[model samples]
Target: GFTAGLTYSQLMTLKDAMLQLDPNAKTWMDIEGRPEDPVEIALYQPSSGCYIHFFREPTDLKQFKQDAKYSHGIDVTDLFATQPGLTSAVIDALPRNMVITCQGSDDIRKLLESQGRKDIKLIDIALSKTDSRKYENAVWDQYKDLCHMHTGVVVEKKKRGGKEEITPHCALMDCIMFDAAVSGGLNTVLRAVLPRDMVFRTSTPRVVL
Candidate 1:
């Protein structure tokens, strides 16, 4: 059987959990659509300098796209579509970590430096498969019955002779995004499953968009 994906209601719960921990957290989402729509976005915490985003497929490496803009400006209005840009990971190995970052930004690593904690170095580590499954299952079980939102969308546009123009937009469904920085920055649910003395560093560098 395949793993269950994230829902809008679930994303909100995760975002809210981070917001409760950090007041200045930034949630990156589409502002043009209704709040109930499903949009794949992320939350970034300046203090911790880290980002959290959920992926549709649970692979071994979580990565972000390097391109900031698409060559073809496509409009994605579908409510059940999946957008392109970031990748998700399952941490199927050991001595490694995962991170979703912006292009050329060391903010992910900075999350450790900001903490000023030496015990948790920017090393490698996992239990990730089963642990991640546990986390996903726990969230799904809690919110699956309450999720009814459509897929989220992104609209790209440009100015046309002093007028606004619409371009192709991307859409995302069943995704989750959130971010936190500093020690004890992660939500209780996430923190509970992570190693308290270790921090994971990702092999994939960054992504823009």
Candidate 2:
């Protein structure tokens, strides 16, 4: 009788998958660092409203730190190495649904509005994290094997800056191929996070990246 954790490659696949979905799904927060700690970051554009959806873990930094799938053995690049402030769900005034990605949970939504806050009405939803990750990998896998040239990174830096200066860049492959793949990826994400009623038609994203 035997069992084991995911291999290095399997873990990387899982890690990358998680990294790509936070912006489109629940917001993750990295609270610590260690063999067993946590992780997090941020994004959102579906709407100006702030919503939260839960599935597996809090999807926070702590979750990532625990899952060596992303925490351990990661590519040490300037981009992801520094955490990029990550993403913190949709940028809105007040929020309840910080992770809602596929189907909005009315109960969560209700909680936000009725009892979440005394002043602002916030909403939240519960989702299946496995399903979300399932599809996220599906989306990226389609193009992961497709070899494409990386367009050199474009940098933005302050002419006169403090020690806080860090490199910001955009590295990619064929714009058309990448965009097409991204659209499919977005479709997978929207379908997983938002309900069919809200996104029955899905989306055809016009990505600039």
Candidate 3:
């Protein structure tokens, strides 16, 4: 209902462009790559993607504002930032899509039906976590950026876990989707017991399974 600025057509175009560039993004968008695999060996697909919001859809006008601020607070800078490299129209479109994503997902498909925006897809639910982590956490943009690797990237100089013997700084992390839905084993740890989890990313549809 409240697109903020750009039309729905414009927003999808940008997201579609991003999906095309990131092949394994499909892993996060559709497959449960070897979250445990090395970035070098991970499954890399072709191009493709979507805007899976990390929060509950805003159906109420007043609550929508609160949700907007809440969603923005957790988002990275560029997705909503109006910077020199970005356009005013695109900047405007970003947030609008962010909210749309917030409102659409397979879980909330029933709710979105009432909104009736044809372009929006009934994306399925894909969860991710690390020791497990959020209702308020969401992201909007090209995810953590694994480039050509589907096994998830392991960059130098980063951050790490709650280790008692933690490194001084600059640690590392490694980390997917829809194959999540089709492959019931994707989310679970033991395949028959432990349960499921989220991608190493967000602003897309994420929940703790």
Candidate 4:
């Protein structure tokens, strides 16, 4: 059976990285001091093998742009800028083996600028809004509108007695392939429940518990 676990050191490293991205990030004071929960780290762990199994697989630029749910009236600058120094900080925190797949939207580009790192490659897919609308619609149909539809369900439920209706507009699915070096098999299974719309990106075939 697969079990999920994290070392104090690894948790601390992830917390530190998150702080770099969102300084005021939520924290809990445990025996080992404050740590950023797995939820926060999951935003970037898109290469973990365990992630690729349950969640959608890692998407390339072409696929991302072609998906209507992912492309649209999104203000990328505002989204990425609001996070302050998340770009460089996050890149530094990720493990070397982790592969990042990002679409060259305004938001992601601004994130890169904040980090002052420009060596990263951007593959242009020449996706137009008209083309993306069809792709996005198809993607949404396939997922049955479950994609990006629950961004703040917990918070909204508190205000609306669980009846507040909200629709997902822009969705970005991230997948990570779990690394045995970081999370053992059993631990990987535990981490799978971290969140929806997030998965590990990998093409290799491996046994998943």
lDDT of 1 by residue, 1-209 (tens): 32134345433443354443233333222111212221333333334433342223111111211011221122232222342211221111111222332211233234333333223223222223333233343334443432322222322444555534322122111112112111212343221112211112223556977
Off by over 4 Å in 3: 1-4, 7-106, 118-175, 178-209
lDDT of 2 by residue, 1-209 (tens): 21123344433433443443434433322111221221211112232222122111223444433332322222122123221111112122224334432123342233334332334322322234343333333434453332121122323334676533211111111111223332444332221222222211233568788
Off by over 4 Å in 4: 1-89, 94-105, 144-168, 173-209
User: Which is the better candidate, 1 or 4, if ranked by lDDT?
Assistant: 4
Cα lDDT listed for each candidate: 0.27, 0.27, 0.25, 0.29
Number of the top lDDT candidate: 4
Q: What is the alpha-carbon lDDT of model 2 when measured against the actual structure?
A: 0.27
Question: lDDT rank, highest first?
Answer: 4, 2, 1, 3
lDDT at 162, model 2: 50
In candidate 3, what are the lDDT values of residues 1-209, reduced to their tens digit? 34444355544554454333332233222111111210111121212222221111222445433322322222222123221211222223222222222111442333323334343343333445321112111110123332211121222333675423211100011112223223332321111110111112134565889
Give candidates' CA RMSD values in order: 19.4, 20.0, 16.4, 17.5
How well does candidate 1 match the true structure in TM-score terms? 0.22
Q: Give the Å shift of residue 163 in candidate 3.
A: 14
Residue 45's lDDT in candidate 2: 29
Which of candidates 1 and 4 reaches a greater TM-score?
4
Please give, for residues 82-152, the per-residue lDDT of candidate 4 as tens digits.
22222233345433332233332344334444544455443333334343343443334444333332333
- Model 4, residue 199: distance off in Å is 13
**Sort by TM-score, top down from the best:** 4, 2, 3, 1
